[PDB]
Design a protein around this ligand. Structure first.
Ligand SMILES: Nc1nc2c(ncn2[C@@H]2O[C@H](COP(=O)(O)OP(=O)(O)OP(O)(O)=S)[C@@H](O)[C@H]2O)c(=O)[nH]1
Ligand SMILES: Nc1nc2c(ncn2[C@@H]2O[C@H](COP(=O)(O)OP(=O)(O)OP(O)(O)=S)[C@@H](O)[C@H]2O)c(=O)[nH]1
Ligand SMILES: Nc1nc2c(ncn2[C@@H]2O[C@H](COP(=O)(O)OP(=O)(O)O)[C@@H](O)[C@H]2O)c(=O)[nH]1
Ligand SMILES: [Mg+2]
Ligand SMILES: [Mg+2]
Ligand SMILES: [Mg+2]
Lengths: 392, 414, 392, 391, 42, 72, 71, 71, 71
């Protein structure tokens, strides 16, 4: 059941223009967005028809659309030519690649193809061809303003843009000219075509109807206090739930065999049969463990702080389940509950237990004002499985 | 352990929860902490005796050998996992201890000058939570912050003269002209960037971090947990009293006045605050009088000096000619007559101001209740007119029915 | 279209000079700014008559009217020149286009035409003609000093600057000089002609009466709201409330067939008839749905966080109403009330309901300290309309 | 009439630099522009006066002096220090004052050569910029050898009328000027100060001609001139929002000042038709602005008051409707954003919920017992009955 | 502190706020009445 | 490339592991190097110091540690 | 990766892009790993030329730097 | 003390180091200090040559700045 | 260390790498340390030449700066 998630994105991406796959981390929001674009436009690498791009806290508008940047000129002293960002190198590219297929009697198809070469150039722009780039870009926005709205809706090559971790960067500052343009109506060819004049280069700029900006928002960090007006109306939000249905015996077998080889799937069958036999011969164990621990998360804390299902999807033995519970669940669980202990043991329903087979044991020396400090406790073997069999 | 007191009420050490030695250790720190911070709060006819009584471990609580007795200082304090709360004796009943909490905070709403909302308190009514004054003032801080952070984040503008690899804002020219060509690859700008971690956001990240560590509800732990995630990028600070003074309330962060004053009320060891029950009734009656006395304007704290100045709690005068002295007393007024200490001060306040004098007193089921009209007319053999007025308290509810009865009795008095 | 939101913009912009269309997101603010200027200037693209720019936090004062911007010359790569921004290139454009039909410029009508060419020139200004541009600019402000105020009251073009999301930038810093020019009797030709002196170039500057500024701020966010009281006097705020009356049966057929004037009017009408026939033949359903949410949001949230009428405007079928509910406005409602479940159950008028045909099912597992949280339910079919009929 | 004109003229001779501070919407820039125009007879900026206005990007390097690239040759970009807006005035106000002196400043060929290179609008070529930099070094060798009696009385009064002085970071823009803006620390004063500039190194001192009349708004308290050492220099004129201008006769005297009896007959019958719909009272808009400014004084502060630039340009009752719902009621709502029982009291409709109220009450309520009002657009004579209840 | 009307720089506005607040206004005086409002400081 | 492993090192006396950036608690994997006091026995302090010194320094190291723990 | 100044035989400042620490250890982990690959033997001479150049210190002339950017 | 470009009439931008306000007072106090005594300060014309090149109203020529740097 | 212009030929202003104080004091401690070392006797007559260049209390001459660079 993953083709409906490649259809839930596909039905919203032609109706609103761009989506945001918001959900708790370790779910597959990066994997769903990357394996939808590769399945749609058959290009396994970034570059031509889609460009992977992540956000960070120090990411700025001048790296995204355009900004003044010092650039060397043929192994010599620097100049101060304005460089287009990662969006404007694909928003202009989605326009000039779509303008190949348009059969109009005003298109400079020799000139547009020259602009397409200078836009897909992986090397930086030398000043012998940077002025040829800015002159041809000036011809493009003199041509786009002359084309009617009837011939600027049917552009064939669907360009994509995987914005990874969209909420980590300051969303209203990055999308400077893109919180008035990213609607389906404010693109080129729509009913409300807007060609926005840019501050730095001074050339007009407008998003084409090819570009779809898929976002993968983690929401355990920099939470739902978003822009709530501009960066919330444009994006059609898709919740990617952490599904424990992929954590049964057959679903772990089906996932790890399709991507596998001939000799790998027989060994993955023997490893998973050894793992679930050590758990009590429960074929639905990791499903029931993740579903039970997700209900305790959404009751105490928010419903978007749940432990995802990319962690337990790559286990083959009890020892690998131990190294994913003590380094990708319990450090993640102590991150959400801000070093709290009396409520982090209720998630494991070990509230009235201490010093035994517990993941958080109480130290036997209280503080001066009666305070108590708990400590994480490593387990191994059947003691750890007995510590997992009472979470259910 | 959670211990609760009413004003001038006692609890037994044998019936009390926790340990006998643990509570008496908590109190001697609290009465000592009240000694060093006594002078910040104002009083009104308190008979405090600052030199001897407060430093003898009788500042807030009188800790005895067989019991624990409360003085007339209302509020709460959390010390050494022994959370103490002192409610007024007027709200004492005959969810069983959830009506006097919302009564006391509403009397702390109108008198003390807070601007909290009634729908903030009505959300908690009926959710069967454990009654605690620290759990609700943390909630009143956390809800009023999360309702003022959900709209806007308070990103305030500072200017930085920063050497940036890109060009943002105004380019500094005197720092770029004198730039050697071996270091020409970075612009030197002066950009007015908006920072999320301003001083008001460093405080609210620290005020939440010291609140989630010391909260006990299941509602405040969820609300402060969302507030701490919204403030994740802010570098933390150690809270002081210099931080709460260094910020000023302009028009661009005026909507953060309501969470900050509650963050200053709870944070600055000890936690919480205490106020005198005599002045808090002296302030609460002042809200009732000026609203209820249209014919004559009333000013609180007017002073006339005999011979050492004895000043009334409130005086109402229409222009300047009528002298109607109104001295607010928290006393129970037993046996339907004023005491020796009360009527002696009423005699001085009338003589140094042909001046009638009215004394307002509390009235509920717990406190002494007189009849509905002006209960006691008195003359002090000098043609005086001492009127004992009593304000009923529908402040445990949300409707002001008794204000109409207080106006009708005052209209017969005026 | 011309009834209220057009005739009250045109009357107020001609009286005050500047209009801000403040309102919640999802309302026709960018649209009524775009429709009014295109229906006035008869130019469906930016450029000559009007310029559509948008503000952001990376927007500079130096890139708005005047600043030092390092250009790239041929032999001297790092050359620091003073470059006029977009407002000084529209204020000087509105001046020298309006000064074609005057009678005191009889010595330099060729110089005004030469200055109009240099401002309409989209090519970057070469330094051999930039001094020709600066000599003509300081000739212009010598010419308006000798022009009477009776002849500068009527300039026959009408230039516009639609700034979009004006409130996002630092409006006290972007409008550096413009915090004392932007008034009807403080432009050129007004009762107090003010020609202020710019910092960088040292040339005097004054906004012509030809210009108009149509801001469209957003007022859902509050940390970027326009509280500058000395700046709120310069503008003339027009509250565009989110009108649910654009969601009736006759109004959706009149709004969606006005723009799309193709032969699909028979297709839209039979689809909109089928959509409302599945809604119980209620011609005022979506009007009542947006009204009974915006009133229930106004009473608990602020009055400026209301759902606009741009979400439910593009609906066509119940499957399309299901897509615009669970993916655009229900993640929006979970953003307004983020883990405040008793409010968001009440906004949808499901306060007593906790099971069955409901959007938010109650979890059957309470917490340690008495807390309890809810869970979404993806509804479909006639049960979804049965969960929408409870709202109205 | 001439009282605010004379009050500026008195304080610009006593302290030297006046500041017209007040709530936004009163005549601050207007009484500053009308003062400099009526005193210098020069309606456009130029040599005798220059209008500037401050902002956060109006730094020190472009106000007094800083490095500025300038070559005027399309080659050999000469990184030289150029004088800002102020030093191009204070040097101009000095060398214009050194004309009328008889024999103290013996520079009658070299001062006029410096003045014609200071008022030159065309930028300075380097063959004449070396003459300008050499004559300016002669000027501060000349000033210093003159007696204070022949330097205090310089005739032509220059004005640097600035605007929004609080809006710029005023302690940073005023650099060397932070100790020169007293009346006795100028040239010719009792204690003259030939202070030294950082960048060029040439000394500098303000002449006694240059007066800085700087208007500011004090509703933004985020940026107010709270430096206590730049309130000693300036003289602060209170410009309150005066509702005396919003009479029938005082509005007819102001709005019919420059019309030449062509549209004045149209304006006279239009104001006759406005006040005939307000209740035949000549004193409506006076006490309307008075009962709002008093009710906004006791709530917000003294400084957030509604000015009289809003209601001054009304002609008919329709234009009062479009200045109420679109300029001042959106202004009144952003003083009190979601503070509804206060903004209901400024219009003193506190008991009035429904009917002819600007803020009708929503029939819904809250789950926790809360409520919120909704703005009601009124039209016709019912709008005036909703407005006359304020008075 | 007690003077609210007459020869005082700050007269009191006649009405208070909705929740017990009250503001003043700077009264301009002239002549010997100004000195009578200045000699009561000392 | 998949050869390059990033072995961090974090002095967490000032900044805790929850006070990092959000793209550091999920890309990396945290090992707590706990302060082991078991390296400060009489025989364990001798074995640690025996790796750095020579044979004649070891008898002086043995005599000094015997003089240390006898005083304690 | 960043910009760093560099002299060209005692002349004016010539800016050149010089790789930092992480890129000089990630490219080094790539060109050392391609030695033991059977498919990367089509360019085993030129890859080995890159690995010698990537472990040495201070490339003094642009004649081996343009060789380095070509490889 | 700081760096400062100085192009005089036709030369290239020779980045001279210009002494600030303080060093033009500190060196001026030291040179006027040593000008009055004679114990071991040989070259009183050389010290006077340094004092003239410190009270220059005009900026220093490169034929005069270099001898100012030596003195 | 950083880049400074020098007093080279008139139309040949050069940007050399003039060392600061910490590089000059650590080289001077290393040169003086190897001057009295016994196993570093391969070029001890040149290490003393490098010591005179590091205690030189003036900006270095351009005709012998390459002698400082080569040592
Ligand atoms: N025909 C018509 N369309 C409308 C009307 N109001 C809104 N719309 C539609 O709403 C859509 C977007 O509304 P828009 O004005 O762009 O919101 P916005 O002002 O940009 O919202 P914000 O994020 O800046 S705050 C447009 O496609 C437009 O067609 C209207 O009154 N008539
Ligand atoms: N005739 C006349 N006009 C006035 C008077 N006061 C204000 N005005 C008019 O009101 C208009 C606005 O006044 P203005 O001076 O621009 O306000 P402001 O103080 O500058 O506004 P601010 O943002 O800088 S704070 C002016 O055009 C002026 O003509 C007055 O007293 N007499
Ligand atoms: N085969 C398969 N793998 C999945 C699926 N969902 C997630 N994964 C795994 O999840 C990993 C990616 O996790 P990621 O998207 O980066 O998590 P996040 O970006 O932090 O939310 C990959 O290694 C996938 O193998 C799925 O539906 N099918
Ligand atoms: Mg991801
Ligand atoms: Mg918009
Ligand atoms: Mg002004």
């Amino acid at each position: 059941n993953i083709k409906e998630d490649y259809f839930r994105v596909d039905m919203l991406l032609n109706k609103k223009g761009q989506v945001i796959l918001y959900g708790p981390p370790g779910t597959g929001k990066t994997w769903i967005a990357r394996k939808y674009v590769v399945e749609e436009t058959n290009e396994k690498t970034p570059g031509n028809k889609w460009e992977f791009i992540t956000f960070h806290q120090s990411y700025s508008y001048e790296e995204f659309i355009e900004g003044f940047r010092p650039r060397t000129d043929n192994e010599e002293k620097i100049r101060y030519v304005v460089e287009d960002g990662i969006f404007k190198k694909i928003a202009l590219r989605a326009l000039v690649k779509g303008l190949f297929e348009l059969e109009d009697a005003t298109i400079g198809k020799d000139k547009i193809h020259r602009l397409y070469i200078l836009l897909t150039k992986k090397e930086p722009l030398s000043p012998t061809e940077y002025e040829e780039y800015l002159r041809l870009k000036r011809y493009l926005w003199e041509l786009v303003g002359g084309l009617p709205k009837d011939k600027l809706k049917n552009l064939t090559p669907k360009f994509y843009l995987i914005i990874d971790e969209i909420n980590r960067g300051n969303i209203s500052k990055i999308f400077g000219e893109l919180i008035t343009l990213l609607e389906k109506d404010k693109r080129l060819g729509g009913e409300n075509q807007l060609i926005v004049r840019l501050p730095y280069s001074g050339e007009p700029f407008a998003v084409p109807p090819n570009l779809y900006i898929i976002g993968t928002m983690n929401t355990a960090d920099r939470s739902i206090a978003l822009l709530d007006v501009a960066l919330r109306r444009r994006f059609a939000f898709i919740e990617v739930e952490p599904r424990p249905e992929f954590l049964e015996k057959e679903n772990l077998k089906k996932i790890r065999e399709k991507k596998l080889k001939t000799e790998d799937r027989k060994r993955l069958n023997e490893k998973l049969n050894e793992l679930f036999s050590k758990l009590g011969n429960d074929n639905y164990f990791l499903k029931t463990l993740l579903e039970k621990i997700n209900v305790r998360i959404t009751v105490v804390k928010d419903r978007d702080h749940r432990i995802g299902h990319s962690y337990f999807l790559n286990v083959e033995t009890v020892e690998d389940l131990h190294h994913v519970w003590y380094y990708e669940v319990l450090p993640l669980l102590m991150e959400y509950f801000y070093n709290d202990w009396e409520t982090i043991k209720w998630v494991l329903n070990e509230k009235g237990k201490e010093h035994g087979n517990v993941f958080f044991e109480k130290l036997r020396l209280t503080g001066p004002n009666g305070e108590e400090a708990y400590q994480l406790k490593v387990l191994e073997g059947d003691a750890f499985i007995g510590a997992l069999k009472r979470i259910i | 352990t959670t211990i609760t007191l009413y004003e001038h009420d006692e609890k037994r050490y044998r019936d009390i929860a926790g340990d006998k030695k643990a509570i008496q250790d908590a109190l001697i720190k609290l009465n000592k902490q009240f000694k060093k911070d006594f002078k910040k709060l104002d009083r009104s006819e308190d008979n405090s005796d600052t030199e001897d009584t407060i430093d003898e471990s009788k500042g807030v609580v009188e800790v005895y050998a067989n019991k624990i007795k409360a003085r007339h200082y209302v509020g709460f304090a959390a010390v050494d996992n022994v959370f103490l709360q002192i409610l007024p004796k007027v709200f004492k009943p005959k969810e069983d201890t959830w009506e006097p909490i919302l009564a006391f905070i509403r009397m702390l709403d109108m008198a003390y000058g807070l601007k909290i909302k009634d729908h903030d308190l009505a959300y908690l009514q009926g959710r069967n939570l454990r009654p605690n004054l620290y759990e609700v003032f943390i909630y009143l801080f956390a809800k009023s912050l999360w309702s003022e952070v959900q709209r806007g984040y308070h990103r305030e503008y500072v200017e930085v003269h920063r050497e940036e690899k890109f060009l943002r804002g105004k380019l500094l020219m005197s720092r770029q002209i004198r730039k050697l060509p071996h270091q020409l690859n970075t612009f030197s700008v002066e950009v007015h960037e908006l920072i999320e971690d301003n001083l008001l956001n460093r405080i609210f990240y620290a005020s939440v971090r010291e609140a989630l560590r010391r909260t006990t509800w299941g509602l405040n732990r969820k609300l402060l947990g969302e507030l701490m995630l919204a403030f994740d990028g802010i570098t933390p600070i150690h809270l002081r009293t210099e931080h709460f003074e260094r910020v000023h309330f302009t028009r661009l962060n005026e909507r953060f006045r309501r969470p900050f004053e509650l963050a200053k009320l709870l944070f600055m060891e000890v936690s919480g605050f205490f106020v005198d029950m005599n002045k808090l009734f002296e302030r609460f009656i002042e809200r009732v009088l000026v609203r209820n006395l249209p014919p004559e304007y009333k000013l609180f704290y007017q002073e006339s000096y005999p011979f050492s100045s004895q000043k009334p709690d409130y005086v109402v005068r229409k222009g300047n000619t009528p002298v109607v002295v109104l001295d607010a007393k928290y006393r129970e007024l037993k046996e339907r007559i004023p005491s020796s200490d009360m009527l002696r001060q009423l005699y001085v306040y009338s003589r140094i101001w042909p001046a009638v004098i009215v004394i307002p007193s509390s009235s509920t089921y717990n406190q002494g209740l007189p009849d509905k009209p002006l209960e006691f007319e008195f003359f002090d053999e000098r043609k005086l007119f001492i009127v004992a007025y009593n304000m009923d308290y529908v402040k445990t509810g949300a409707i002001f029915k008794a204000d109409k009865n207080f106006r009708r009795s005052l209209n017969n008095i005026i």
